[PDB]
Design a binder for these strands. Structure first.
Ligand SMILES: Nc1ncnc2c1ncn2[C@@H]1O[C@H](CSCC[C@H](N)C(=O)O)[C@@H](O)[C@H]1O
Ligand SMILES: [Zn+2]
Ligand SMILES: [Zn+2]
Lengths: 629, 276, 255, 255, 255, 252
RNA sequence: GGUAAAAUGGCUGAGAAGCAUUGGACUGUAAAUCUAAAGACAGGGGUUAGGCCUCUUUUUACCAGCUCCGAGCUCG
């Protein structure tokens, strides 16, 4: 038997993170409710995934399986031969649906253990699956609860330690209260002296908890039983590095870089509870957020203070918010790609919906998220790579919730995307959870310059899109990145034009279509060093993007989609003129800020002097190795 | 204390523990708070007793065994000849500085290892045909390093032909003619310069905290250099930091007109496959 | 005996030159200290008593030595003994290939002038001073004692100029002894080893300790009182002439 | 053998230097005659062939010796042997009581700097040139040979300055040989004694004829060819270093 | 040139004497090896050819030396060169206080009876043979070369009997050179330092390396071929007489 | 000084040794005369007083020197100074071509036995005697002074054997001083020139006395004794040869 | 910033042991010895029955994921 066993709260149920546990043991590791952004949080806090044998999903819902594809492709790159999923039987259909936009994922092996399957035991823990059906093949009323029993460890004579069990219960709504109460299997452990359940993790809204029946249900487990509750009432910072960076940059320009936003124990990030050595509420790694320390560290930098002083002594719509400026994997500072455009105070357009985009939006706007989602008019998806579209279902569900809370009619959203995306969402809607009743999708090919009206419904939808977003015209073109990869361009009645490239290479159709653009957003994955790799991987370098922008003769040029090689900042080639800018998570850019952007280069150089120096040293070492090769 | 009970019980189990124990090392044992530290300390005592007992049997095994030009008094003559060479080097030799400012960052075990490496380095320097003029800069009196050095050398400490001082290398030599050797330096050592003064940090740093010597050098605006280990051999495994004796032998080989491919013969072979 | 003798001691304000002055004044002789005005010769002259007079002079200058001899003749009336103890040293290799350094000619010239040229100047002027002395019943008019370190026979590394000057003194000892033989003046030379004078203290302490330890017997630095004893022995003995005596301790200096 | 070697011979326009140059050039070596401009060395250099060149220089001045060494390096590209056969000589007693004459300081200074200081100047400047030669199989880089007459050991009446300079040369040989030992340069000294050079021929004919009879064997004045032969033998032998050789024919000078 | 000369070499069956014989025979001379019968010199004489003849004799006794000289005169007709390169070495302290041991008199006596008495016996017997030669056009009749050591100048601990014998040769080389001057015989002495003779190469590798490092330059043990070269140079030079040459490498023996 | 100090003087019946004994006994020391039985040194020992004892011995014989040292130990209790002033002398050319005469080996060997072998025989035994002394506060246990004439440097015609023995002593001085240095014994050598010894004492003696540069006369054994006392008193004289000559360098 | 493997502070190992290092010895020619000192397999943690399990550092390799079915460059 293992010598130590403890739990850990990766996410505490906050609206922008979901909930998830992490069962650590010397022999095995387990995960519960892999939602959106769980991979980023676990990577930030150094939680290894090397031996993540089993992943337990308590409910077939996008709030519990959102980040499943990301974890699967990470474990694969990790080299794990087989991973086993446990939960509702619909996972098999979900796995089939994932392959529509991804590949066949041959390398890693996937297995499913539904609740109807026989019980699974390990070298450290026995797991029982309890199916719960709400009152009153897609099934929208199934929730699985888990009861994990540890193996008995013989004493060292030291008396042996009997196995202590813990229970994970999910109660998404009041309709599930009675089925949980009336379940006979729970009474086997609850009303008895058999290994009185050490800790029970409750993930249910606070309105459910205050119910008398639920309150009596928890109390019947005994006085010694603990109770942990991840119920969206947590007040804890999840992304410490993001908060640090945003607070530091806010010191430069507040507008361009706005600031972010019965006994029971409310969960916190990195909260632990040991079970094998002893039984205590460890609480040794609880995150602590203090902006004063961050600004002190920023001010003590060798060159930051003088640079910001020099910049400061020198001295509207539409406005662009860069929610995410990273390419493949989510990282500590940069999320996956996204871009919010605010055409009018009452309308908005989402330019790309990466995984966990809603989380970044909620962090950026705080309590204003409900109002913002009301103004969301359309979403554009450019090419069906992962981490460019996987965050869409979260946006749709949260938009429905925000519309319900704000008291507005449920009108379907407009989605401009390749027709291949229809199959993925169609299968997910048919097999797992209803989604399609929220969107009215428009194929991207129908908006081409030489396109033709496929159906009168499509023409009606595009006309409705133009009316809602108040745009004069919407255009798309096929960029040279992959099969069915599209750009976009928006022209307002005011006359300003915005062009979004997407993943691409230097192309001529984009230049022809986006002529005389007011603001250009272009992919800048790599630098001049690896132009061969960029050609091989179908991506553009920094100077390539700059040349494309200059040839198209845009007023300003913005770069994003930076590679994982890049940690904090890209290189700043002497080619960086007053027109070329750079993007960071959560900055706001307005048309009046174009002259200001070049002035921000010295402060940004000072704030990241060590990082850019280390990157330059690494590049020099690589060049020396290449020369000596 | 009660530690002797567990000591005897583990000795009965024979779980790599010393046969006996003394009072002072016992107090040091209770001054270890982690069971890992106590286990490591007991294993250190255990391996000490074993090697001490094992080497004793060699004495027993050895116990089973005209016109001349010179009397067999060679050891005295070699010692006197090395003394004369060292006396000349103390006047006309090229200075070499060992910086003892790293006394704070070293634990007791690393301190003892530093003293042993310093002993070996001085011994190798004495035997050379053209010795350096070894300096012990920043050697605070009655410090831990100084006390250990006078304990190991005993009465020889007052007769060693090297300059030991409490001052700093900047207070003895012009700042231009000082080069601080370190593995983290960006500049790569090309050739040995006979007009410069080389500073070697008397450091062990097993609990790796790189950049200490580089920070100390850059604090005084001193020049820095690193050995071109990479340019001449295939580095496979192991940190590029070298021991003090290896560094002094490399510098001695370079000082005596030797080439790089010959000076680097003292780098351990377990770290590199071979030359380029 | 040395009672009533008048001695002129060059460099007699420190080191070997002061010990002989102390011993001769204690025995009952009269001494004149010949040293540079910068050195505290007047303090030692006052300390030694009324039989000691400090004469500020430079051995390398003919006029200074002439004035000092005139002062000695005026104060005491005669000169019977002359001891040459003044001498400087330099530590510089002839050529350093690794460092690319060459011995300067100025250092060599200055050492040669102070050690060798000054000794000959004092000898050739004090000899003229003794030439007027009435012959002793043994026919002796005066004694001249020089100092030439053991580097004249066994030089060390970086000791080229000092060895050259001392070797010049040793080589010229005999011809001067033959020159002054008709006028009854004895010329003798002493070759001190490591004697712990201020000259030797310029070396680091550890080097001095090692050099002291390498003396066969006694294993210590020389005592200037022993040098003074040997000087008195030379004066009393009438048959010592034109010979170099090594007051060393049987030390042979390795490279 | 000495074939291909380049030699710099100070005073190589008459006497022992000219004889050494003649023998060395005859064996196939290359020689550079270093002497005063008025010494007539250009005629000797022309006579000895294109393998011998004349460099006008004064050994007592650093600049002239440096220019001569630069000329030798330009002509031949290498310096392998440096033989010092230069030096003036005077004769005056230290003090003449019967005549009231005292030895002049100017004559002593002139003899000292020409004989002793000039030799060291040439040695220190030449050692820089020899240090650039690549060491041979035996590690040798060059040979330096000096001259110091037997007056350094047993001087005569009036040879005070001469004996001082020669004794200084003899005494400084060992420290210089120890200095250049790591470099790989051998230093040796020769004591010619009585030779048929014009210096000995400047004395009255009867005196020289009597002197040739005082040599035990052979009872004649030294032949400069014999000195040249000894110089070549010193050059060829690799184990002769730091030693003074008396080429005097077993003569010991009397008062 | 040494072509046609007949040389008598004592202790010439091994060591320095064998090398001297090899070089002299190689240049066209004739040699007679003079060494003990058990030394195996007959094989060496056979190897060197019919120009070399082994003479079994002991230098301590007069009769064997006379027999060897008679054999040499019978075989070749004359004796022109005599080289004394035979001797034993003994190391023993004068007194050891800790061990209570004293230098036995027999060890001291037997060293003198070979190194010193034997050398003089050979010299006095050979000088009679060389006196029958018709004088050379330079007046020379023969050359005698002895072999002292640097122990005669810087003896080490234990070399008290060795230095006494070798010191006697250095002392007597001059009076003998004056004795044979009327006859026309030159007597010279060589004092080799550390040479790679078979007696010394038998030492372990570590001490051999230390001794090689002791020599300043060249930092190696001496080569007997260099000793033979110096002997030939002494033979050829007519003006070398009554002088000791130190073939050492500038090594001053450590105490 | 030399008060209460015991000295063993070889060849003290007459010559330089007798003058050394006279001076040392006069200064308050104790002397032991070591000479041949027929040398008549018993009368001199009686004349000097109760501090002088005549011990008949032959330096070439181990037993005689051992018995003499035992007598000195019995009489005074310790030995502090040893002055080796004994020695014979012989004039004979190595080879005389006109007469055909050759130097005899027996004559050469006889001089070596007395001058060189006798000095070492006395030294090696008196050093053992001196080793039993308690070290002086300066570390000194005893002083050994040898005599080796100036023939060791410039020998005359016919002085082959004499120069050989004297040069042997001069060469032997340094290694013996190094041997006895750890014990604490100083070994020093004096090189007298032309002295008024009975051997040297009309035309030849007058010419030789004139030959000395200064003083133009023969040496004085009193001056030799004074030099011996000075060497004894001075603590830093060791392993060196002093030439008490008068600046005279002999000629062929 | 990630993924995987490794880490001997005198050097090789083995998993014990050799070659080494420092202080002392006036060595009779095996001192080729005697004697005293220092012996920690990256560093922390844990446990542990070794041995594992984990954290950190360093060295050396490596770092996108377009799925369908027939029309077969478009169609769902
Ligand atoms: N590879 C290398 N190149 C140059 N100097 C080196 C070196 N390895 C060690 N040294 C020198 O020898 C010392 C050994 S200790 C090295 C540890 C030190 N904390 C550091 O990493 O800088 C170093 O301090 C440095 O002075
Ligand atoms: Zn992308
Ligand atoms: Zn893409």
């Amino acid at each position: 038997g293992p010598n130590t066993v403890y739990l850990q709260v990766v996410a505490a149920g906050s609206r922008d993170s979901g909930a998830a546990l992490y069962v650590f043991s010397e022999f095995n590791r387990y995960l519960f409710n892999c939602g959106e952004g769980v991979q980023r949080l676990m990577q930030e806090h150094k939680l290894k995934v090397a031996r993540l044998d089993n992943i337990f999903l308590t409910r077939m819902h996008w709030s519990n399986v959102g980040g499943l594809s990301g974890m699967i492709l990470t474990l694969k790159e990790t080299g794990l031969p087989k991973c086993v999923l446990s939960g509702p039987p619909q996972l098999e259909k979900y796995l089939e649906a994932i392959k529509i936009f991804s590949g066949p994922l041959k390398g890693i092996e996937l297995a499913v253990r539904p609740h109807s399957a026989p019980e699974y035991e390990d070298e450290t823990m026995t797991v029982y699956q309890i199916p719960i059906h709400s009152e009153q093949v897609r099934d929208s009323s199934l929730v699985v609860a888990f009861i994990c029993k540890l193996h008995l460890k013989r004493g060292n004579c030291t008396p042996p330690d009997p196995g202590a069990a813990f229970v994970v219960v999910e109660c998404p709504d009041e309709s599930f209260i009675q089925p949980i109460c009336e379940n006979a299997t729970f009474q086997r452990y609850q009303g008895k002296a058999d290994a009185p359940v050490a800790l029970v993790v409750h993930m249910a809204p606070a309105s459910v908890l205050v119910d008398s029946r639920y309150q009596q249900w928890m109390e019947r487990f005994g006085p010694d039983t603990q109770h942990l509750v991840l119920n969206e009432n947590c007040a804890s910072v999840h992304n410490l590095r993001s908060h640090k960076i945003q607070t530091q940059l806010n010191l430069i320009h507040p507008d361009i870089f706005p600031l972010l936003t019965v006994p029971m124990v409310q969960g916190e990030c990195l909260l632990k509870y040991q079970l094998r050595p002893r039984r205590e509420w460890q609480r040794d790694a609880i995150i602590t957020c203090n902006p004063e320390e961050f600004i002190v560290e920023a001010l003590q930098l060798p060159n930051f203070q003088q640079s910001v002083q020099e910049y400061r002594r020198s001295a509207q719509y539409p406005e662009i918010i860069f929610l995410g400026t990273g390419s493949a994997i989510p990282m500590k500072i940069r999320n996956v790609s996204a871009t919010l455009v605010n055409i009018s105070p009452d309308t908005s357009l989402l330019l790309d919906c990466g995984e966990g985009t809603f989380g970044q939006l909620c962090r950026h706007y705080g309590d204003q998220v409900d109002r913002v989602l009301g103004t969301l008019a359309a979403v554009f998806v450019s090419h069906l790579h992962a981490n460019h579209h996987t965050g869409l279902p979260s946006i749709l569900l949260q938009r429905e919730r925000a519309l319900a809370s704000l008291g507005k009619p449920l009108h379907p959203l407009l989605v401009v995307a390749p027709n291949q995306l229809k199959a993925w969402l169609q299968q997910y809607h048919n097999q797992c959870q209803e989604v399609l009743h929220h969107i009215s999708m428009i194929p991207a090919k129908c908006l081409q310059e030489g396109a033709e009206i496929s159906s009168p419904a499509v023409e009606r939808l595009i006309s409705s899109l133009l009316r809602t977003c108040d745009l004069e015209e919407f255009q798309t073109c096929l960029v040279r990145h992959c099969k069915h990869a599209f750009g976009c361009a928006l022209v307002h009645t005011s006359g300003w034009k915005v062009v979004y490239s997407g993943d691409t290479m230097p192309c001529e159709a984009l230049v022809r279509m986006g002529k005389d653009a007011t603001l250009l957003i272009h992919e800048a994955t790599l630098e001049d060093g690896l132009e061969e790799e960029a050609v091989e991987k179908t991506h553009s370098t920094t100077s390539q993007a700059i040349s494309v922008g200059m040839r198209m003769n845009a007023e300003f040029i913005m770069l994003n989609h930076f590679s994982q090689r890049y940690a904090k900042v890209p290189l700043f080639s002497p080619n960086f003129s007053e027109k070329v800018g750079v993007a960071f998570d959560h900055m706001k850019v307005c048309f009046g800020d174009f002259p200001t952007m070049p002035k921000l280069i010295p402060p940004l150089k000072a704030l990241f002097a060590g990082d850019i120096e280390e990157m330059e040293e690494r590049r020099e070492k690589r060049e020396l190795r290449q020369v000596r090769a | 204390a009660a530690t002797r009970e567990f000591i005897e019980m583990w000795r009965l189990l024979g779980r790599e523990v010393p046969e006996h124990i003394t009072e002072e090392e016992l107090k040091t044992l209770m001054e270890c708070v982690s069971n890992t530290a106590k286990k490591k300390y007991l294993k250190y005592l255990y391996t000490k007793e074993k090697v001490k007992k094992a080497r004793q049997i060699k004495k027993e095994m050895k116990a089973a065994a005209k016109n001349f030009l010179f009397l067999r008094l060679w050891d005295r003559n070699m010692d006197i000849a090395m003394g004369w060479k060292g006396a000349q080097a103390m006047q006309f030799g090229q200075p070499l500085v060992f910086d003892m400012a790293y006394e704070n960052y070293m634990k007791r075990k690393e301190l003892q290892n530093t003293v042993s490496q310093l002993l070996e380095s001085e011994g190798w320097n004495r035997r050379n045909v053209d010795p350096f003029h070894i300096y012990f800069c920043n050697l605070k009196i009655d410090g831990a390093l100084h006390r250990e050095l006078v304990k190991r050398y005993q009465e020889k400490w007052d007769k060693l032909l090297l300059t030991s001082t409490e001052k700093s290398h900047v207070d003895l030599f012009p700042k231009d003619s000082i080069i601080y050797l370190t593995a983290d330096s960006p500049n790569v050592m090309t050739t040995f310069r006979h007009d410069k003064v080389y500073v070697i940090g008397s450091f062990v740093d097993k609990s790796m905290q790189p950049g200490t010597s580089l920070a100390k050098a850059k604090r005084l605006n001193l020049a820095t250099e690193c050995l071109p280990l990479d340019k001449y051999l295939q580095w496979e495994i192991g940190n590029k930091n070298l021991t003090l004796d290896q560094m002094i032998r490399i510098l001695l080989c370079l000082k005596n007109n030797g080439n790089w491919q010959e000076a680097l013969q003292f780098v351990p072979k377990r770290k590199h496959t071979g030359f380029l | 005996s040395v009672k009533g003798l008048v001695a002129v001691i060059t460099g007699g304000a420190s080191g070997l030159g002061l010990a002989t002055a102390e011993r001769l004044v204690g025995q009952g002789a009269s001494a004149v200290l010949l040293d540079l005005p910068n050195s505290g010769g007047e303090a030692q002259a006052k300390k030694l008593g009324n039989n000691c007079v400090f004469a500020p002079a430079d051995v390398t200058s003919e006029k200074d030595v002439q004035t000092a001899l005139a002062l000695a003749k005026g104060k005491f009336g005669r000169v019977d003994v002359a001891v040459n103890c003044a001498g400087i040293a330099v530590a510089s290799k002839t050529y350093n290939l690794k460092k690319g350094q060459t011995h300067t000619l100025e250092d060599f010239q200055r050492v040669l002038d102070v050690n060798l040229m000054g000794t000959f100047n004092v000898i050739r002027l004090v000899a003229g001073e003794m030439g007027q002395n009435e012959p002793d019943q043994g026919g002796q008019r005066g004694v001249i004692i020089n100092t030439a370190s053991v580097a004249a026979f066994e030089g060390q590394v970086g000791q080229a100029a000092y060895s050259a000057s001392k070797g010049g003194i040793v080589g010229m000892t005999l011809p001067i002894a033959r020159d002054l033989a008709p006028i009854g003046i004895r010329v003798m030379t002493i070759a001190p080893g490591l004697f712990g004078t201020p000259l030797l203290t310029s070396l680091p302490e550890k080097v001095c300790n090692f050099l002291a330890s390498q003396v066969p017997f006694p294993s210590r630095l020389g005592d200037p009182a022993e040098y003074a004893h040997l000087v008195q022995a030379i004066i009393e003995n009438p048959f010592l002439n034109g010979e170099v005596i090594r007051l060393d301790g049987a030390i042979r200096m390795q490279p």
